[PDB]
Amino acid sequence: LDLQKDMVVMLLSLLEGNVVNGMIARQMVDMLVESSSNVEMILKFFDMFLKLKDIVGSEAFQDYVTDPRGLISKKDFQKAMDSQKQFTGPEIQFLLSCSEADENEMINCEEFANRFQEPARDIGFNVAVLLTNLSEHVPHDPRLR
Amino acid sequence: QWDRLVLNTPSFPSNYWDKFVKRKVLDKHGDIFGRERIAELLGMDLAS
């Protein structure tokens, strides 16, 4: 993630002094469109975990955390995520695979929600800055939209 | 604080035209807050 942030800093440097509808800005948008699938995957990663942090704090989620320790079984976690209606089935499977469930299939929801927050903060902010810069300097582009 | 008394009444929207505000609220905040919890707050009978 730090390396991603360095690459995005280089990309942002390429836009210094750029004008509206600038050539380098349009080239950067073309490069993003060429990497459409991977850009979508990265954005989905960030979105998925930012949404996980909110769902774990949501009250409707805590209705399934009934064990005294505060852990949630994998099946109950699946049920809670299904009820929240915020993830697809494959996304919930991926979250379960990342949950680091213990031998008893119990998940520490607090640690799971906070695991990727700080590691991904810098690259997430830089991606937001890159998208904002490109959007404001290439106003009419549905590919960027 | 006083408006808390009218949330679960059967006839909350008596003068205001929108008679489905409770349904709209349930659909909007139902998933993140709990459909049963919202139904209890707004005095709705989900089954019926």
Curated annotation (Swiss-Prot), chain B:
Binding site for caffeine: 17
PTM statement from Swiss-Prot or TrEMBL: Channel activity is modulated by phosphorylation.
Disruption phenotype: Perinatal lethality, due to severe defects in skeletal muscle development. Neonates do not breathe and do not move. Mutant mice show defects in muscle fiber development. Their muscles do not show a contractile response to electrical stimulation. In addition, mice display abnormal curvature of the spine, thin limbs, and an abnormal rib cage.
Organism superkingdom: Eukaryota
Localization, UniProt: Sarcoplasmic reticulum membrane
Function: Cytosolic calcium-activated calcium channel that mediates the release of Ca(2+) from the sarcoplasmic reticulum into the cytosol and thereby plays a key role in triggering muscle contraction following depolarization of T-tubules. Repeated very high-level exercise increases the open probability of the channel and leads to Ca(2+) leaking into the cytoplasm. Can also mediate the release of Ca(2+) from intracellular stores in neurons, and may thereby promote prolonged Ca(2+) signaling in the brain. Required for normal embryonic development of muscle fibers and skeletal muscle.
Family: Belongs to the ryanodine receptor (TC 1.A.3.1) family. RYR1 subfamily.
Assembly and interaction partners: Homotetramer. Can also form heterotetramers with RYR2. Identified in a complex composed of RYR1, PDE4D, PKA, FKBP1A and protein phosphatase 1 (PP1). Repeated very high-level exercise decreases interaction with PDE4D and protein phosphatase 1 (PP1). Interacts with CALM; CALM with bound calcium inhibits the RYR1 channel activity. Interacts with S100A1. Interacts with FKBP1A; this stabilizes the closed conformation of the channel. Interacts with CACNA1S; interaction with CACNA1S is important for activation of the RYR1 channel. Interacts with CACNB1.
Comment on protein domains: The calcium release channel activity resides in the C-terminal region while the remaining part of the protein constitutes the 'foot' structure spanning the junctional gap between the sarcoplasmic reticulum (SR) and the T-tubule. Pore opening is mediated via the cytoplasmic calcium-binding domains that mediate a small rotation of the channel-forming transmembrane regions that then leads to channel opening.
Name of this protein: Ryanodine receptor 1
UniProt source species: Mus musculus (Mouse)
Residue window of the full protein shown: 4698 to 4745 of 5035
